[PDB]
Structure formats: C-alpha cells, structure tokens
C-alpha cells in the first residue's frame, strides 16, 4: 500500500507514535517519506546482506526474521515480511522499540540526514488529525 502523507499521519497518531519517546508525528511522517516514499512494500538490501522493510525501512540484521541475515537477531518477534503489510501495527510497534534503543531516532540514519533539525511539522501541516 502506498499511503498519502495525512492518511500515514493519522495511522501513525491512532498507532501512538505522535511525541512517542518525544518524537512528535513529523519527525515520523518525515522519516517514512525518505526511507519507504510512504511505501508498505518498500524492500532495500544492505551492503552486509541485511534487508531493510516496509515504510520505516526496519533492518533484518536486529529487529525481524527473513531466514537470509547470518548471525542476525529478530528483536521485534516478527517475520520481516509482516512489515510489509498494508495493515502498519507491525513496523509501528518495532519501530517503538527501536526507537527505545537510546539512540532515539538517529537509528534512522535517513531521519539523521533528513529530517532533524527541519521545520518537521510541515510534513502533518493541513492533516485532519
Ligand atoms: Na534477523
């Protein structure tokens, strides 16, 4: 499923995510734009053989089994393909753990590079929420 920009919005507010360990909704919207272009079904392989999925481009190396990542971990309990679902319960509950990890949002490093320190409440600006 490829969301709009408000309708990601308001899944993610009903999902909890909005000021979620201080991260207000922007800084999420704005994160899913540049990792998953607001893409479920966004897949990305990494140099080390590690795949990243679904909007929040979530990582096989640590967070979510797909039986191909040597030495991973599945911190999330989850196939990594349930981060690809239209439905986003799944990337929305690993990504509050990840974002627990105490690197906050820079686990994002698209986040880091693109969204912090930006005017991130334009990306919710004009949302029915
Ligand atoms: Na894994």
Redesign the pocket.
């Known amino acids: 499923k490829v969301f709009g920009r408000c309708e990601l919005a308001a899944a993610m507010k009903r999902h909890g995510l909005d000021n979620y360990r201080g991260y207000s909704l922007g800084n999420w919207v704005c994160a899913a734009k540049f990792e998953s272009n607001f893409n479920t079904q966004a897949t990305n392989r990494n140099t080390d053989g ?1 795949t990243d999925y679904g909007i929040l481009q979530i990582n ?7 039986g191909r ?1 040597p030495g ?3 911190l999330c309990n989850i196939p ?1 393909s349930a981060l690809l679902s239209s439905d986003i319960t799944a990337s929305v509950n690993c990504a509050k753990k990840i974002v627990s990890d105490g690197n906050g949002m820079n686990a994002w490093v698209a986040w880091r590079n693109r969204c912090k320190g930006t005017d991130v409440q334009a990306w919710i600006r004009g949302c029915r929420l």
């Open positions: 590690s096989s190396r640590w967070w979510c089994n797909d990542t991973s971990r599945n990594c």
